[PDB]
Protein backbone atom coordinates (compact mmCIF):
# COMPACT_ATOMS: atom_id res chain seq x y z
CA UNK A 1 0.00 0.00 0.00
CA UNK A 2 2.83 2.40 0.94
CA UNK A 3 1.33 3.37 4.30
CA UNK A 4 1.97 1.75 7.69
CA UNK A 5 -0.56 -0.61 9.21
CA UNK A 6 -2.21 0.73 12.36
CA UNK A 7 -0.11 -1.65 14.53
CA UNK A 8 3.04 -0.36 12.76
CA UNK A 9 1.98 3.23 13.42
CA UNK A 10 1.44 2.49 17.13
CA UNK A 11 4.89 0.79 17.13
CA UNK A 12 6.46 3.85 15.45
CA UNK A 13 4.96 6.15 18.06
CA UNK A 14 6.40 4.02 20.90
CA UNK A 15 9.82 4.15 19.24
CA UNK A 16 9.83 7.96 19.55
CA UNK A 17 11.04 7.23 23.11
CA UNK A 18 14.12 5.28 21.86
CA UNK A 19 16.41 8.02 23.29
CA UNK A 20 14.79 7.93 26.78
CA UNK A 21 15.46 5.88 29.91
CA UNK A 22 12.36 3.73 30.58
CA UNK A 23 11.26 2.99 27.02
CA UNK A 24 8.17 0.70 27.04
CA UNK A 25 10.28 -2.21 25.83
CA UNK A 26 7.71 -4.97 26.59
CA UNK A 27 5.04 -3.07 24.65
CA UNK A 28 7.44 -2.80 21.69
CA UNK A 29 8.05 -6.57 21.95
CA UNK A 30 4.29 -7.18 21.63
CA UNK A 31 3.56 -4.57 18.91
CA UNK A 32 6.48 -5.82 16.75
CA UNK A 33 5.41 -9.50 16.75
CA UNK A 34 8.24 -10.42 19.14
CA UNK A 35 10.86 -8.49 17.14
CA UNK A 36 12.02 -6.00 19.80
CA UNK A 37 15.73 -6.54 19.10
CA UNK A 38 15.35 -6.18 15.30
CA UNK A 39 13.15 -3.04 15.45
CA UNK A 40 15.14 -1.33 18.20
CA UNK A 41 18.50 -2.05 16.54
CA UNK A 42 17.21 -0.87 13.14
CA UNK A 43 15.86 2.37 14.66
CA UNK A 44 19.18 3.06 16.45
CA UNK A 45 21.32 2.28 13.36
CA UNK A 46 19.16 4.70 11.28
CA UNK A 47 19.25 7.39 14.03
CA UNK A 48 23.06 7.23 14.39
CA UNK A 49 23.51 6.96 10.56
CA UNK A 50 25.45 3.71 10.86
CA UNK A 51 24.16 2.20 7.60
CA UNK A 52 25.65 5.03 5.54
CA UNK A 53 28.85 5.36 7.61
CA UNK A 54 29.66 1.62 7.41
CA UNK A 55 27.97 0.95 4.03
CA UNK A 56 25.65 -1.71 5.49
CA UNK A 57 22.97 -2.85 3.01
CA UNK A 58 19.57 -2.43 4.66
CA UNK A 59 18.33 -5.93 3.68
CA UNK A 60 21.57 -7.44 5.05
CA UNK A 61 21.04 -5.60 8.39
CA UNK A 62 17.43 -6.72 8.75
CA UNK A 63 18.34 -10.32 7.78
CA UNK A 64 21.24 -10.44 10.25
CA UNK A 65 19.14 -8.85 13.01
CA UNK A 66 16.24 -11.29 12.52
CA UNK A 67 18.73 -14.18 12.51
CA UNK A 68 20.40 -12.95 15.77
CA UNK A 69 17.01 -12.49 17.44
CA UNK A 70 15.95 -15.99 16.30
CA UNK A 71 18.92 -17.41 18.26
CA UNK A 72 17.67 -16.00 21.55
CA UNK A 73 15.49 -18.66 23.19
CA UNK A 74 11.76 -17.77 23.43
CA UNK A 75 11.35 -20.27 26.31
CA UNK A 76 13.96 -18.47 28.52
CA UNK A 77 12.20 -15.96 30.82
CA UNK A 78 14.97 -13.40 31.32
CA UNK A 79 17.93 -13.99 28.96
CA UNK A 80 15.91 -13.63 25.79
CA UNK A 81 15.52 -11.16 22.92
CA UNK A 82 13.63 -8.64 25.09
CA UNK A 83 16.58 -8.41 27.47
CA UNK A 84 18.97 -8.03 24.51
CA UNK A 85 16.81 -5.17 23.09
CA UNK A 86 16.74 -3.49 26.55
CA UNK A 87 20.52 -3.67 26.95
CA UNK A 88 20.99 -2.27 23.41
CA UNK A 89 18.60 0.61 24.09
CA UNK A 90 20.09 1.36 27.51
CA UNK A 91 23.63 1.42 26.04
CA UNK A 92 22.25 3.75 23.30
CA UNK A 93 21.05 6.19 25.97
CA UNK A 94 24.31 6.02 27.98
CA UNK A 95 26.38 6.69 24.81
CA UNK A 96 24.54 10.01 24.39
CA UNK A 97 25.23 11.40 27.89
CA UNK A 98 26.53 15.03 27.85
CA UNK A 99 29.76 14.06 29.64
CA UNK A 100 30.65 11.76 26.72
CA UNK A 101 29.80 14.08 23.79
CA UNK A 102 32.29 13.67 20.90
CA UNK A 103 34.38 11.19 22.92
CA UNK A 104 33.74 8.00 20.89
CA UNK A 105 34.25 7.25 17.21
CA UNK A 106 31.55 5.77 15.03
CA UNK A 107 33.40 2.41 15.10
CA UNK A 108 33.52 2.48 18.93
CA UNK A 109 29.78 3.31 18.98
CA UNK A 110 29.13 0.44 16.52
CA UNK A 111 31.15 -1.87 18.83
CA UNK A 112 29.21 -0.97 21.99
CA UNK A 113 25.78 -1.38 20.31
CA UNK A 114 26.65 -4.63 18.46
CA UNK A 115 28.19 -6.11 21.65
CA UNK A 116 24.98 -5.22 23.54
CA UNK A 117 22.81 -6.90 20.88
CA UNK A 118 24.77 -10.18 20.90
CA UNK A 119 25.87 -10.32 24.56
CA UNK A 120 23.48 -13.15 25.70
CA UNK A 121 22.61 -14.82 22.38
CA UNK A 122 21.81 -18.57 22.59
CA UNK A 123 21.65 -18.40 26.42
CA UNK A 124 20.19 -21.71 27.69
CA UNK A 125 18.74 -20.11 30.85
CA UNK A 126 21.22 -21.80 33.20
CA UNK A 127 24.45 -20.56 34.78
CA UNK A 128 28.05 -21.25 33.86
CA UNK A 129 28.37 -23.41 36.98
CA UNK A 130 25.40 -25.59 35.95
CA UNK A 131 27.05 -26.19 32.57
CA UNK A 132 30.38 -26.97 34.25
CA UNK A 133 28.90 -29.38 36.84
CA UNK A 134 27.05 -31.41 34.23
CA UNK A 135 30.18 -31.74 32.02
CA UNK A 136 28.36 -30.03 29.15
CA UNK A 137 30.01 -29.94 25.72
CA UNK A 138 30.01 -26.12 25.94
CA UNK A 139 31.97 -26.23 29.20
CA UNK A 140 34.40 -28.76 27.66
CA UNK A 141 35.00 -26.49 24.63
CA UNK A 142 35.60 -23.40 26.73
CA UNK A 143 37.58 -24.98 29.60
CA UNK A 144 35.02 -23.92 32.22
CA UNK A 145 36.14 -20.28 31.73
CA UNK A 146 33.49 -17.65 30.87
CA UNK A 147 31.69 -20.52 29.10
CA UNK A 148 28.46 -18.66 28.25
CA UNK A 149 30.15 -15.32 27.45
CA UNK A 150 32.59 -16.97 25.05
CA UNK A 151 29.63 -18.79 23.44
CA UNK A 152 27.52 -15.60 23.04
CA UNK A 153 30.45 -14.00 21.13
CA UNK A 154 31.11 -17.09 18.93
CA UNK A 155 27.42 -17.30 17.97
CA UNK A 156 27.07 -13.53 17.37
CA UNK A 157 30.02 -13.60 14.97
CA UNK A 158 29.20 -17.00 13.38
CA UNK A 159 25.73 -15.83 12.32
CA UNK A 160 27.37 -13.18 10.06
CA UNK A 161 28.16 -16.12 7.76
CA UNK A 162 24.51 -17.05 7.11
CA UNK A 163 22.88 -16.02 3.81
CA UNK A 164 22.96 -12.23 3.35
CA UNK A 165 23.93 -11.68 7.02
CA UNK A 166 27.44 -10.10 6.82
CA UNK A 167 26.65 -6.59 7.98
CA UNK A 168 30.44 -5.86 8.12
CA UNK A 169 31.08 -6.90 4.51
CA UNK A 170 32.20 -3.35 3.50
CA UNK A 171 34.45 -2.61 6.50
CA UNK A 172 38.21 -2.71 5.87
CA UNK A 173 40.30 -5.42 7.60
CA UNK A 174 41.67 -2.69 9.93
CA UNK A 175 38.12 -1.63 10.85
CA UNK A 176 37.05 -5.30 11.33
CA UNK A 177 40.03 -6.18 13.50
CA UNK A 178 39.43 -3.13 15.72
CA UNK A 179 35.67 -3.72 15.92
CA UNK A 180 36.16 -7.40 16.75
CA UNK A 181 38.63 -6.72 19.57
CA UNK A 182 36.35 -4.11 21.15
CA UNK A 183 33.27 -6.35 20.91
CA UNK A 184 35.14 -9.29 22.49
CA UNK A 185 36.55 -7.09 25.29
CA UNK A 186 33.06 -5.75 26.08
CA UNK A 187 31.13 -9.10 26.07
CA UNK A 188 33.75 -11.05 28.08
CA UNK A 189 33.48 -8.26 30.70
CA UNK A 190 29.74 -9.05 31.20
CA UNK A 191 30.69 -12.25 33.12
CA UNK A 192 29.60 -11.35 36.69
CA UNK A 193 32.77 -13.01 38.01
CA UNK A 194 34.60 -9.98 36.51
CA UNK A 195 32.40 -7.35 38.24
CA UNK A 196 34.55 -6.40 41.25
CA UNK A 197 37.74 -5.98 39.21
CA UNK A 198 35.81 -3.99 36.59
CA UNK A 199 34.37 -1.73 39.31
CA UNK A 200 37.83 -1.37 40.94
CA UNK A 201 39.30 0.02 37.71
CA UNK A 202 36.29 2.32 37.08
CA UNK A 203 36.86 3.83 40.56
CA UNK A 204 40.56 4.41 39.78
CA UNK A 205 39.53 6.11 36.54
CA UNK A 206 37.11 8.39 38.40
CA UNK A 207 39.95 9.15 40.87
CA UNK A 208 42.17 10.34 37.96
CA UNK A 209 39.18 11.74 36.00
CA UNK A 210 40.24 14.36 33.48
CA UNK A 211 37.98 16.69 31.49
CA UNK A 212 38.29 19.27 28.71
CA UNK A 213 37.10 22.81 29.70
CA UNK A 214 33.38 22.73 28.96
CA UNK A 215 33.85 19.41 30.60
CA UNK A 216 33.45 16.30 28.48
CA UNK A 217 35.54 13.29 29.59
CA UNK A 218 39.11 12.94 28.28
CA UNK A 219 40.22 9.43 27.21
CA UNK A 220 43.70 9.23 25.60
CA UNK A 221 44.40 5.50 25.13
CA UNK A 222 42.61 2.25 24.21
CA UNK A 223 42.78 0.97 27.80
CA UNK A 224 40.76 3.93 29.13
CA UNK A 225 38.33 3.99 26.22
CA UNK A 226 37.56 0.26 26.32
CA UNK A 227 37.31 0.37 30.12
CA UNK A 228 34.54 3.01 29.86
CA UNK A 229 32.79 1.02 27.11
CA UNK A 230 33.00 -2.23 29.14
CA UNK A 231 31.56 -0.54 32.23
CA UNK A 232 28.87 1.21 30.14
CA UNK A 233 27.48 -2.09 28.75
CA UNK A 234 27.89 -3.75 32.19
CA UNK A 235 25.80 -0.84 33.64
CA UNK A 236 23.21 -1.43 30.88
CA UNK A 237 23.18 -5.17 31.70
CA UNK A 238 22.61 -4.27 35.39
CA UNK A 239 20.18 -1.40 34.65
CA UNK A 240 16.82 -3.08 35.56
CA UNK A 241 16.68 -1.59 39.17
CA UNK A 242 17.32 1.92 37.76
CA UNK A 243 14.21 1.81 35.53
CA UNK A 244 10.66 2.80 36.62
CA UNK A 245 9.28 0.30 39.11
CA UNK A 246 6.67 -1.04 36.63
CA UNK A 247 9.52 -2.14 34.32
CA UNK A 248 11.86 -3.25 37.15
CA UNK A 249 9.23 -5.57 38.67
CA UNK A 250 8.65 -7.24 35.28
CA UNK A 251 12.41 -7.97 35.04
CA UNK A 252 12.55 -9.29 38.63
CA UNK A 253 9.63 -11.69 37.96
CA UNK A 254 11.41 -12.93 34.83
CA UNK A 255 14.84 -13.49 36.41
CA UNK A 256 13.23 -15.23 39.40
CA UNK A 257 11.29 -17.46 36.97
CA UNK A 258 14.55 -18.39 35.18
CA UNK A 259 16.49 -18.91 38.47
CA UNK A 260 13.74 -21.04 40.09
CA UNK A 261 13.61 -23.17 36.93
CA UNK A 262 17.36 -23.83 37.24
CA UNK A 263 16.82 -24.67 40.95
CA UNK A 264 14.08 -27.13 40.00
CA UNK A 265 16.50 -28.81 37.55
CA UNK A 266 19.29 -28.88 40.16
CA UNK A 267 16.88 -30.38 42.74
CA UNK A 268 15.55 -33.09 40.41
CA UNK A 269 19.20 -33.94 39.50
CA UNK A 270 20.36 -34.21 43.13
CA UNK A 271 22.65 -31.20 42.78
CA UNK A 272 23.02 -28.48 45.38
CA UNK A 273 20.63 -25.66 44.53
CA UNK A 274 22.45 -22.50 43.39
CA UNK A 275 22.12 -19.21 45.30
CA UNK A 276 18.76 -17.49 44.70
CA UNK A 277 17.36 -20.54 42.77
CA UNK A 278 15.29 -22.21 45.53
CA UNK A 279 11.59 -21.46 45.11
CA UNK A 280 10.93 -23.07 48.53
CA UNK A 281 13.49 -20.89 50.34
CA UNK A 282 13.43 -17.46 48.67
CA UNK A 283 13.50 -13.90 50.06
CA UNK A 284 12.79 -11.86 46.92
CA UNK A 285 12.48 -8.47 48.64
CA UNK A 286 15.53 -9.01 50.92
CA UNK A 287 17.51 -10.25 47.91
CA UNK A 288 16.71 -7.17 45.78
CA UNK A 289 17.79 -4.80 48.57
CA UNK A 290 21.05 -6.79 48.86
CA UNK A 291 21.54 -6.85 45.09
CA UNK A 292 21.17 -3.06 45.00
CA UNK A 293 23.32 -2.31 48.09
CA UNK A 294 26.17 -4.67 47.23
CA UNK A 295 26.28 -4.66 43.40
CA UNK A 296 24.02 -2.20 41.55
CA UNK A 297 24.24 0.97 43.68
CA UNK A 298 28.07 0.79 44.02
CA UNK A 299 28.41 0.40 40.24
CA UNK A 300 25.95 3.17 39.31
CA UNK A 301 27.16 5.63 41.98
CA UNK A 302 30.64 5.23 40.46
CA UNK A 303 29.28 5.69 36.90
CA UNK A 304 27.31 8.77 38.03
CA UNK A 305 30.57 10.22 39.40
CA UNK A 306 32.29 9.61 36.03
CA UNK A 307 29.54 11.47 34.14
CA UNK A 308 28.46 13.84 36.96
CA UNK A 309 25.70 15.18 36.97
CA UNK A 310 24.27 13.35 33.91
CA UNK A 311 23.10 10.22 35.80
CA UNK A 312 21.47 11.89 38.82
CA UNK A 313 17.87 10.96 37.94
CA UNK A 314 18.85 7.34 37.14
CA UNK A 315 20.57 7.13 40.54
CA UNK A 316 17.53 8.77 42.26
CA UNK A 317 15.22 6.18 40.67
CA UNK A 318 17.47 3.34 41.84
CA UNK A 319 17.34 4.70 45.41
CA UNK A 320 13.51 5.03 45.28
CA UNK A 321 13.16 1.43 44.07
CA UNK A 322 15.57 0.24 46.79
CA UNK A 323 13.40 1.93 49.43
CA UNK A 324 10.22 0.42 47.91
CA UNK A 325 11.60 -3.13 48.18
CA UNK A 326 13.00 -2.38 51.66
CA UNK A 327 9.56 -1.23 52.82
CA UNK A 328 8.06 -4.45 51.35
CA UNK A 329 10.19 -6.93 53.35
CA UNK A 330 7.89 -8.84 55.73
CA UNK A 331 9.41 -8.58 59.25
O1 LIG B 1 20.06 -8.19 36.53
C1 LIG B 1 19.77 -8.81 37.59
C2 LIG B 1 18.43 -8.65 38.23
C3 LIG B 1 17.48 -7.85 37.69
C4 LIG B 1 16.17 -7.71 38.36
C5 LIG B 1 15.93 -8.40 39.51
N1 LIG B 1 16.93 -9.24 40.07
C6 LIG B 1 18.11 -9.39 39.51
N2 LIG B 1 19.11 -10.25 40.10
C7 LIG B 1 18.88 -11.00 41.35
C8 LIG B 1 17.90 -11.94 41.49
C9 LIG B 1 17.74 -12.64 42.81
C10 LIG B 1 18.56 -12.33 43.84
C11 LIG B 1 19.64 -11.30 43.70
N3 LIG B 1 20.52 -10.99 44.78
O2 LIG B 1 21.41 -10.20 44.67
O3 LIG B 1 20.40 -11.62 45.96
C12 LIG B 1 19.77 -10.67 42.49
C13 LIG B 1 20.43 -10.39 39.44
O4 LIG B 1 21.29 -11.12 39.94
N4 LIG B 1 20.75 -9.66 38.21
C14 LIG B 1 22.09 -9.83 37.58
C15 LIG B 1 22.23 -11.21 36.97
C16 LIG B 1 21.35 -11.45 35.81
C17 LIG B 1 21.40 -12.64 35.21
N5 LIG B 1 22.27 -13.67 35.69
C18 LIG B 1 23.06 -13.49 36.71
C19 LIG B 1 23.06 -12.19 37.43
MG1 LIG C 1 25.29 -12.67 30.24
ZN1 LIG D 1 22.58 -9.72 29.84
Swiss-Prot record:
Positions of Mn(2+) binding: 120
Annotated Zn(2+) 2 binding sites: 120
Gene: PDE4D
Entry comment describing in which tissues the protein is expressed: Expressed in colonic epithelial cells (at protein level). Widespread; most abundant in skeletal muscle.
Organism name: Homo sapiens (Human)
Entire protein: shown range: 384 to 714 of 809
Function: Hydrolyzes the second messenger cAMP, which is a key regulator of many important physiological processes.
Domain (PDEase): residue spans on this chain: 3-331
Residues at the catalytic site: 79
Binding-site positions, Zn(2+) 1: 83, 119-120, 237
Compartment(s) of residence: Apical cell membrane; Cytoplasm; Membrane; Cytoplasm, Cytoskeleton
Protein's name in the database: 3',5'-cyclic-AMP phosphodiesterase 4D
